[PDB]
Amino acid sequence: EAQQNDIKALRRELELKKAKLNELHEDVRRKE
Amino acid sequence: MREIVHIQGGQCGNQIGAKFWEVVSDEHGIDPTGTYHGDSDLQLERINVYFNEATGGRYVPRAILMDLEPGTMDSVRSGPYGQIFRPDNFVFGQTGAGNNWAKGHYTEGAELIDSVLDVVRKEAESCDCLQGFQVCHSLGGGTGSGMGTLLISKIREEYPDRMMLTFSVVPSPKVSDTVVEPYNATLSVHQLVENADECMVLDNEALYDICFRTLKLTTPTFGDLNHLISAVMSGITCCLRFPGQLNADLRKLAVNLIPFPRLHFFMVGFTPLTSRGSQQYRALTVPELTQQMWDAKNMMCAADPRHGRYLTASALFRGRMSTKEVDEQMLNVQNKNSSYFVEWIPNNVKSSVCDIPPKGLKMSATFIGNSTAIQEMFKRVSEQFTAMFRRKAFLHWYTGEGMDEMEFTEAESNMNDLVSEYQQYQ
Amino acid sequence: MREIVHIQGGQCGNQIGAKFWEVVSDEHGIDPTGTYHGDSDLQLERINVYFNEATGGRYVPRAILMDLEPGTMDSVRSGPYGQIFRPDNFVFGQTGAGNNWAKGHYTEGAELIDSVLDVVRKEAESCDCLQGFQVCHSLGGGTGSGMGTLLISKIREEYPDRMMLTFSVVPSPKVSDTVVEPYNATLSVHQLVENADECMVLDNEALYDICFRTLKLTTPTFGDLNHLISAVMSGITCCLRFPGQLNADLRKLAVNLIPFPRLHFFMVGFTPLTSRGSQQYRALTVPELTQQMWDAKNMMCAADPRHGRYLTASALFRGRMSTKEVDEQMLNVQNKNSSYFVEWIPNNVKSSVCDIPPKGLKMSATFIGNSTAIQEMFKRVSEQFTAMFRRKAFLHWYTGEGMDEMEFTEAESNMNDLVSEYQQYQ
Amino acid sequence: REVISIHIGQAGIQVGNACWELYCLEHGIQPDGQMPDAFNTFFSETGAGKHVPRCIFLDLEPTVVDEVRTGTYRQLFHPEQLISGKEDAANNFARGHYTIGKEIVDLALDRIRKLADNCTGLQGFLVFNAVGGGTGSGLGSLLLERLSVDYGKKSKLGFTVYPSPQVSTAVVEPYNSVLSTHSLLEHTDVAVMLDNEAIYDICRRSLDIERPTYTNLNRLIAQVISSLTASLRFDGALNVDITEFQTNLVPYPRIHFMLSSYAPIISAEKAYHEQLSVAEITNAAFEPASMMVKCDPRHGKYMACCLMYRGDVVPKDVNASVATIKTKRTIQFVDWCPTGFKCGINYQPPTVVPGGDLAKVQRAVCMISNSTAIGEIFSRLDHKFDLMYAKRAFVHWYVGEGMEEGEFSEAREDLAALEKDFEEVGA
Amino acid sequence: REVISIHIGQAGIQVGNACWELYCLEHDAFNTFFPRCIFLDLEPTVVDEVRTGTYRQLFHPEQLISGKEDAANNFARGHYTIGKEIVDLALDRIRKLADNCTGLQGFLVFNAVGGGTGSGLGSLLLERLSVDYGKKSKLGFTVYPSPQVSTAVVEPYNSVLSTHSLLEHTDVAVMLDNEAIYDICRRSLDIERPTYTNLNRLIAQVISSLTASLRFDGALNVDITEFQTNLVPYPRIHFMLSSYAPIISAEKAYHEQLSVAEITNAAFEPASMMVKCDPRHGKYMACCLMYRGDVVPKDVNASVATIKTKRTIQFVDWCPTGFKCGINYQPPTVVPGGDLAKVQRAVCMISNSTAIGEIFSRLDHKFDLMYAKRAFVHWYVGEGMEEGEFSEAREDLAALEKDFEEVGA
Ligand SMILES: Nc1nc2c(ncn2[C@@H]2O[C@H](COP(=O)(O)OP(=O)(O)OP(=O)(O)O)[C@@H](O)[C@H]2O)c(=O)[nH]1
Ligand SMILES: Nc1nc2c(ncn2[C@@H]2O[C@H](COP(=O)(O)OP(=O)(O)OP(=O)(O)O)[C@@H](O)[C@H]2O)c(=O)[nH]1
Ligand SMILES: Nc1nc2c(ncn2[C@@H]2O[C@H](COP(=O)(O)OP(=O)(O)O)[C@@H](O)[C@H]2O)c(=O)[nH]1
Ligand SMILES: Nc1nc2c(ncn2[C@@H]2O[C@H](COP(=O)(O)OP(=O)(O)O)[C@@H](O)[C@H]2O)c(=O)[nH]1
Ligand SMILES: [Mg+2]
């Protein structure tokens, strides 16, 4: 059960990081 | 002109097809007795794609029911839109496979597949310019999966140039009805990767989940789930039946969403889907349709697309709408969520607009994303398959029927090399 | 174009917001069904600020209800104008905090606030140009104070460049509904001074005083209190919805009334507010609105400003008025009582006029004064906080949830230096 | 010859609503834009019988612009002219000069270019703004900066509204006035001040209106502009142009601030019982009970004065009347200037608009003078601006927008230097 | 004198459905059009909308050609597999259309290169027309895919493979994007939500303005052979930016004072080009100005002088006389339900420059990225193609880029 919690935490962190990355990419496109 | 022959297999195929012919007959304005009673002119000129004029305005569907148990045939014949089929098209065995893929693929199929092929041939050459065949079946059952799969292989041997659609449901461990689901689904996919043209993957978890969350139904019987699947199938072949500002046939969608020949497993979604209590609290605009389309909690598969990347995507729109709004919305979702899309492919979204909405609605949409998140289920299945096959559970029920150990190893091999190629292209 | 998304938290927030949406919808001529039935074209020009057109005259309010117990949600859908809210905007927990700021800010908030954030995001991106957010809540309860304050902090780090109004009633010893009022108020104010752009102090004691003398009501239920608060909220944002000879928007008011980033606690009053027995004997001119505006017994807080000094003040006038009269009245009340005003700022009063009165009156006004006397509440609350915390009363319900002791000491220090810093500029 | 008129801010375009109202009612054009050649200075002709004004309304808040889009004159104004932003500067000079100004002034410029290109003998521009706000102050100064670098030699008549000494509506307006004048100093060629308390007192005493709104204020401002452009629009016995004021009234390239007045502002009843001639209106134009800026020229000394005369006026008595003023000793002129007057007479009387509170007068005088009493107002502004700046009140809003503490001190000493400049020319 | 028009594809015949509506509404002057047309497509859905539409009796039944099944956004399918059975029937009709004619100026073709029918059998029709007639002009007004606005996925493959034949087959090729036209309808026509119908209406305006010289007598007439000389300085550089003025609504038109000087200017700003490219990066090689309606030669003469003396735009060092004017007397007509107001005079400008060299370079990367990983190539190869023609079409556009850079210097 412990490893299951690790899975559902790492994906959520991974998801937040991917969303931040998209924001940065969008800003570069607008600024260029 | 362009022709679609319908083939339904097994209990799942028959009941899904029953609801399908209900909604298509209403769209073309045909009564349960078989005679035209519609109002608009538009509903007459494109009924040959699905019907045949017999005599005295009797339009009979171009369908083939196929199973091994009479309960499904009698339930079909009993209900409304049951007396519109030709009784000769109810090709029907007698013994029954019963969730044994070997029975439906080697023993019992061997005496039925001859009769179905006779009917489908006579029904195929009856029309002039065939567009393709349309099959609805399952991958957990025996007479649906095994016989339907064998029928797919024989058909692709005879007609190798014609198109082929397969609406197939796959089993998931959260909704697991039979015990031998992995043994069936793994072998069934082995044949689907080499025989079908494209497969629109379905599942019951997402369907039950959709009716809970978005539709907020209380008792979602199979009728409502089959109603949703039918609405998807009507949306995918609305371009042939009605004029639009931009048309996209079956072949047109296939070439724009399949970048490599073995990468033909899709996810499907339908919009708009709203609760009955909130149907009047909403607008009907293209941006609203797009927000509900690209929601990951709206696919009709239990595979979250945000767990991977989209290779391509498709949006078939129906209704009087401005094409500019269509392209701007597709471009907007292509720029803001840049990481979820593949990089060495710009323009991962093909779009199309038809001018006739489904009956009762103003504007609808159908989404077909070819993502690389679909590989989780194949891994989600293969881990179960190995769990049984490491220790030969239930294996003798198939071995004493003809399958040898090399067949299961081959099915694992094809499953494993497939999940690696999805992982490669992500 | 300029847009306000509305957020109601807790039981206090839900009744205040309920009577608020009735008052605005009645101003814009929208019936309980939610369809337009007004006459003037002017009422349609500025409905984008608070509503969205759905279909066929259906206007839905741009509000989000957020609480923890379903009694408030069902009481909202029961009453009139209850059928206008979109049912999806009823984001909602199930367990209940119950007058425990730690339960409202650490345990139940951590799983509800992602949901309320997602609704707010859709409501913010659904519109084009945000003017600000509008949050109504209390400071004594738990599901309003702790959760709402966490929502404020989360939103401010998301959209940092937009305004934000929060209307908060605060506890007082004479109206003491719960026992842990200071432990909730002191921690809530600590977060408000560092997050909110501007706050509008309210209290229930002054509202009861208004209903006794000015309204002369027999049975002042909560409906009338919410009626007064709603009239104030409509009065301040009237400038964005209607044109006038001198328009003053929310940001224009904020920069004109806040001299220093920590001095953003205002006391509010509204005129005319007269009993039905004396409403017949009255006249409607500018001087009679002012000398009822600037009366100390009309403020909606229990902080008498003549026990302090005025930094700045503002009046928002509604109705066809002469701007010369408006300015000379502000000049007269500032020249006579010069001691009550700050000395190193001349012309302490910002004034504006709008040309649309509320229905039922010919001329009205709305006063917003940023005095220094608001520190009476901070000392008045902090001593009760100290009286329990010196002896560790009720502490374990806060401590055993995740909070430690330095949180209370830091909160004490910040509230204490705040009342100290108000006193220095005094 | 043509002159285009630009309006910035809430007060700016409201003033324009009264001006173009007065213009069409003077030249006999209905609000829809068609007649039932002197209109060529302000209206360009489509060639299909439709006349369009040479003006651009622009501001940052869409409220005041869109009642104009739906009033009676929906069809008079070309749509592109009525520029409108999306959100207001909110009484914040920096916000109008750097944050929001930088997006909107470039659209105004590439508009105003084709207004000038349609013109042939462009006499100049004339701008309307109130310095108390953020739009009229911030992007107004920014617009004047870019106008000076574009044209330079063309006149820019600035009819500005300064904040009143005691009657005020905003609280950060001392900051806005000082920073705005810092650039209005070296850009506007001829800048006319129009206070608000002075106009309030005129409507209270002269027009005997005890309850005036902004409508009457804007009405009489349009009357002064009409009296000032009649010399350009129509022929008279002795006319002047807009390039005449550049030379004849400002002795030094930094002293350009004029006190305006107009006579006779008389209600409908006094005119019936009172007499109009040139001598008494020449008198009434000088008394401080009829000035448009709260200052007293009795405390100052005149450099040069200007006198617009409208209606049935012969030139012999304007000379005799100005002679009587010079022989009086209540007002005195600077030692360096022996002659201090610039006179002008035009044939057409001022027309009246229905609904206004101005009577139909046979003759009128519009006086525009330059003095040193204007130095007292600027000093009066410095006391209360410096009053709050030392403690750094309200500075955090402007510096949060992207400014610093440097521009306050450097703008402060520049206008402080101007105080010393005014005192040394008066000696 | 007559000129016949061919329409290919979903985009081609919808453009024609608006173009012919304008021709009938506009009308011995008719002799050049009255129709001398052919619609042809592989999908029968859009052609048979015409067969039952309002213009049932207007078109002779045979004219409306229609295949059996679509090429489905597949250049190879519409050029090798399915084209081979319908193209022969089409051109063996167009021949007898030309035999009906006596003084044929030329043909004009309408196609979009993104699709399979517009691109594939477009080029196939062009190749048999070039070997059959050779000398007669064939004006091709094509629709190239936009850089950022896009509806298909494999359209880079189609656009490159179509261009390789559009070079040496058509005589005068006018680019038209969809984003640029969308921007035009958004900016000038202030239509915030446009559809394909509005685009096709103003495309017809451009076509009508360049054939009105044949139809009606003007002060300075210009034939189709005139564009052949005056705008293409090299046999392989014929790609024209288009523009039109005044594109204006019904209310704004009355308010503004349309004249010759300002519309000659407005037809030169990049805010009014029919192709998404910035000619500020390029240098004008030649310009052509069709004036319709109320035009005296003086103000058009004065207007080209002001353009030459401006420095916001530059010309090549080769042409001091870098213009070709043309004046016709009859004003442009209007369609009920159309959005363009009636104007005394209008200008359709067709130029040639090096800004077009940017669109090909922009196109190259998108095609290059997909081709490197061999995306979608298996569809085209199984249709009948090979890897040879993909790589060789790639190097043809590479040569064209160097060509524009060399001539522009
Ligand atoms: N004389 C005169 N002054 C006016 C009128 N309307 C507004 N004002 C003045 O304008 C000043 C404030 O500026 P506004 O024009 O109202 O607002 P703004 O300049 O656009 O600046 P923002 O409020 O930030 O948009 C006030 O001090 C008024 O004195 C008017 O009708 N006549
Ligand atoms: N301007 C304009 N362009 C159109 C129109 N219809 C389609 N297009 C363009 O055509 C391109 C795709 O080709 P289509 O014409 O739709 O289809 P096709 O050329 O016949 O090829 P197939 O789909 O295989 O039949 C898209 O990129 C659109 O931009 C139209 O009505 N007007
Ligand atoms: N959506 C849907 N799924 C069905 C229906 N009937 C059966 N299934 C699914 O089919 C699977 C069993 O397939 P089965 O009916 O035994 O196939 P067959 O025996 O080969 O005909 C189960 O997982 C069910 O969830 C139906 O009416 N609708
Ligand atoms: N003005 C007003 N105040 C209310 C109303 N209902 C509750 N309150 C105030 O709410 C305070 C207690 O907060 P509570 O409702 O428990 O907040 P919550 O539990 O966080 O939602 C009391 O001091 C009341 O004065 C109402 O209808 N109107
Ligand atoms: Mg097509």
Residue numbers in the entry:
A (entry chain X1): 119 to 150
B (entry chain B5), C (entry chain A5): 1 to 426
D (entry chain A4): 2 to 37, 47 to 437
E (entry chain B4): 2 to 28, 47 to 53, 63 to 437
Quoted from the paper:
They are categorized by their two major roles inside cells; cytoplasmic dyneins travel along microtubules and are responsible for both intracellular and intraflagellar transport, whereas axonemal dyneins are docked onto doublet microtubules inside cilia and power ciliary beating. The ODA has a single large dynein motor that repeats every 24 nm and influences the frequency of ciliary waveforms.
In Chlamydomonas, the ODA-DC is a heterotrimer made of a coiled-coil of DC1 and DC2 and a calcium-binding subunit, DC319,20. In the ODA-bound state, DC3 sits midway along the microtubule-bound portion of the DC1/2 coiled-coil and interacts exclusively with helical bundle 3 of the γ-HC. They bisect the tails of β-HC and γ-HC, making contacts with both, and span as far as the ICs, explaining the ability of both ICs to form chemical crosslinks with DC1 and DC240. Thus, the tails of β- and γ-HC are required for the attachment of axonemal dyneins to doublet microtubules. The ODA is tethered to doublet microtubules almost exclusively through the ODA-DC, explaining why mutations in ODA-DC subunits are associated with decreased levels or complete loss of ODA complexes from doublet microtubules.
